């Protein structure tokens, strides 16, 4: 309840880093959790019938012991991600399974094995304390976080951090996540908060924006250049949305795939011009559960070439998986690249390798981002080149609903959660720049 | 005749380039053809039972009219490739199909549209004539050809020749192929003949060797480095046999896959140590027609890790396709590369994308080689770092038998064919360099 003083300092204009170091830490703080004893509570239910509102709690939890390379952070806002939702419906298996294995290494990792699991993989807020060996970050710094958690003990990840052998995700494979008033992070997660954004907007892009950055823009991904034709599946929502922004900002031409006229319009408001509606076109890429339709590939490809004016796809931004993959490979230009980071419709991909090898195409696997790529992504927001796609904000004590919202896919844009922030709209330091980009910032509201 | 007179000049030491240039081209030369009026002779018979002995003809054919950027060459020796076999059994469709579509375009492509198709995609011999616009090659030059045929009119291949939209394969989608006394080639197919090799030894690596170089060694493929663990399917045969040589020569560790211990012995005589017999260890990656077995993948990986001392595969040399692909993707190291150029077992690939995206792996399709890559491949042979894999040499008039040999798959080493050469063993100029590598050159003899 001395949490109020902590908020007062953040809200205070003249509060110094000394003041922040002087703030007493609360004995407990409010946190969204799932409980270890409740992991089997959806037994006998199909996934869709599982209600996150039944599993999610709002607990007074004690502040974790702070270790080396770590920071405690007063969280003003977080977001609900797909992985948070999975955690809440305990699928494929409870997150406690790993937390229990992991917690057996050292006393530091044991901290994470608790009867409750604090979730959330995004964060906008301010540093409260730092641990041994931390010098880059001081108490009072306004920050956002990425969710890659790595000890970098193995050599593997020192020429690209994603290749670390025990790479984990903060709030998912970690306790003390961001859907709470206070969080515990590795400082190698902390990034500067863009000054022209609200807490909730700052927390919004995180995991989804960086994934798109590595996958499409970085040299570990498609290494996109201006002029490239980029096929973007699910262009109007989550992942596809940020990919569309990167395609546009970096001078490429995005071909946007959607399910409805409403979603086509969302794409257009981003500045996308070439749009395909799978539904209105009625693509049936799969003739049945075991055989694909090369005639549907050819028709999809015909439609693309019409919009480009004779030209095939340089880069496919993939993530639906099985349903689309055959077509994705097919429509790609000779020498082109298929870039994948998920398989939402099924992970068993089938494609015709003749179109891959004979056309000199490549398939590249991407996943989240390393600290540089995540910084660079966050930087592009701070420069006002990429914009957050926040759609709706819930309060902390409505996080169950917030998860239900994402679970039932009710919105294309991001679903935000205020943690310490008492209301929406707070945390802007650069009014001049917000006013200059506000229209783009507010593109995804309520949609 | 007039042809014997050409052979006389070739077999001479004296003969100047001035002599060659004054030599008379014959009215007709001997050549291996298939007939346009005999394409439906495979009837309803199954693939295995199709016999190239009954379809391959030895015809007396007129010399084609020479065009710009082209050369006529007296062919001393050639070789039987897979594409030659497919042609002679008319699968998946006749080659007279494309050739008729091709000849309608230019009056010089009309040359390639004849009642007969002179086949063959490998070549060692000596330049007879060059057409307008060619200076780099003179009558009398000892040459070996690569089989890429590109007009390069489009901008697409000017940063990598393979990306040409109208890339054709010489002898396959072209007439006047290698298996004849004279061949017609583009001059951008010509390379210097390795002086320490017999005519037939020089012709053996061509197609198969350049393919393996681009796929594994070059920047367009795996870009292999010393210390890498390379999984090489079909390691004792054609393609794998050169892949295995490149892996060793470049200081990588080849993990060779074979189906018999006889084949294992070939891989050891190449200096490879880590060997898996798929047949003796009874790997069954497909539980049935539609479903794979991840336990078998896993078991295969454990055997790999057993041979490498704990390490997964850096680079996979794929070409079998559907049967082995799923396993390839599994067993590749985090951040590693799967490299593919065929799908002999079937082109409809199925793999688990979770293993691709989450481990940051990549599938790079490759196909043949560009002029630079073909030259570099042939140069590594010239420098005696890579050796021909000759198994048996047939005469011109025994080609049908050699074709039958390759289709039945009775030999591991490349099958050679004498064309103009009266006997095996002619063409050596550096006997001293031959002396140094002779055992290595002969590793595949009668194997």
A few lines on this structure:
Chains A, B: Homodimer. Chain A has 447 residues and is α/β, with parallel strands linked by helices.
For the structure shown, list the relevant keywords:
alpha/beta; Quinone Oxidoreductase, Chain A, domain 1; Rossmann fold; 2 domains; globular; oxidoreductase; Reductase; Carboxylase
What would you note in describing this structure?
Two copies of one chain form a homodimer. With 447 residues, the first copy, chain A, is an alpha/beta fold. Chain A has helices at residues 3-11, 17-22, 52-55, 82-88, 96-102, 107-110, 199-203, 206-217, 238-249, 261-270, 278-281, 294-308, 322-331, 353-357, 371-382, 399-407, 431-441, and strands at residues 29-35, 57-61, 70-79, 116-118, 124-130, 142-145, 148-149, 168-169, 182-186, 190-192, 229-232, 253-258, 274-277, 313-318, 332-340, 348-352, 362-365, 390-395, 414-418. In chain A, the strands form four sheets. In chain A, strands 3, 5, 6, 9, 10, 18 and 19 form a seven-stranded mixed beta sheet that branches. A six-stranded parallel beta sheet of chain A has the order 13-12-11-14-15-17. The first copy, chain A, is built from 17 helices and 19 strands. Helices cover 32% and strands 22% of the residues of chain A. Chain A is globular. At the A-B interface, strand 15, strand 16, helix 14 and strand 17 of A face strand 15, strand 16, helix 11 and strand 17 of B. Strand 16 (348-352) of chain A pairs antiparallel with strand 16 of chain B. Chains A, B: Homodimer.
């Amino acid at each position: 309840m001395t949490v109020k003083d902590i908020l007062d300092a953040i809200q205070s204009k003249d509060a110094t880093s000394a003041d922040f170091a002087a703030l007493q830490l609360p004995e407990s703080y409010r946190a969204i959790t799932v409980h270890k004893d409740e992991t089997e509570m959806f037994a006998g239910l199909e996934t869709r019938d599982k209600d996150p509102r039944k599993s999610i709690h709002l607990d007074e939890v004690p502040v974790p012991e702070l270790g080396p390379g770590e920071a405690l952070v007063a969280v003003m806002a977080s977001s609900v991600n797909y992985n948070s939702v999975w955690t809440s419906i305990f699928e494929p298996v409870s997150t406690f399974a790993f937390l229990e294995r992991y917690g057996k290494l050292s006393p530091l990792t044991k901290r994470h094995d608790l009867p409750y699991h604090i979730i959330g993989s995004d964060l906008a807020g301010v540093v409260l304390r730092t641990g041994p060996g931390v010098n880059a970050w001081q108490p009072g710094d306004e920050v956002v976080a990425h969710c890659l958690s790595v000890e970098l003990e193995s050599p593997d990840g020192h020429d690209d951090t994603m290749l670390d052998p025990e790479q984990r995700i903060w709030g998912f494979e970690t306790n003390f996540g961001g859907l709470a008033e206070i969080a515990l992070v590795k400082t190698n997660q902390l990034m500067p908060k863009p000054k022209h954004l609200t807490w909730e907007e700052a927390a919004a892009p995180g995991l989804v924006n960086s994934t798109a950055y590595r996958q499409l823009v970085s040299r570990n991904g498609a290494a996109m250049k201006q002029g490239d034709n980029v096929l973007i599946w699910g262009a109007s929502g989550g992942l596809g949305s940020y990919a569309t922004q990167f395609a546009l900002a970096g001078g490429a031409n995005p071909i946007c795939v959607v399910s409805s006229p409403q979603k086509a319009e969302i794409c257009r408001s981003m500045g996308a011009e070439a749009i395909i509606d799978r539904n209105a076109e009625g693509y049936k890429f799969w003739k049945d559960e075991h055989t694909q339709d090369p005639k549907e590939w050819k028709r999809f490809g015909k439609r693309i070439r019409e919009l480009t004016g004779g030209e095939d796809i340089d880069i496919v931004f993939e993530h639906p998986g099985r349903e689309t993959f055959g077509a994705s490979v097919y429509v790609t230009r000779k020498g082109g690249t298929i870039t994948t980071c998920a398989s939402t419709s099924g992970y068993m991909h089938e494609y015709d390798n003749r179109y891959l090898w004979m056309s000199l195409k490549r398939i590249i696997g991407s996943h989240f981002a390393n600290y540089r790529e995540a910084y660079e992504a966050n930087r592009l927001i701070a420069k006002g080149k990429i914009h957050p796609t926040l759609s709706k904000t819930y309060s902390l004590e409505e996080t169950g609903q917030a998860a239900y919202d994402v679970h039932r896919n009710l919105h294309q844009g991001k679903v935000g959660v205020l943690c310490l922030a008492p209301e929406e709209g707070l945390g802007v330091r650069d009014a001049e720049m917000r006013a200059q980009h506000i229209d783009a910032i507010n593109r995804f509201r309520n949609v």
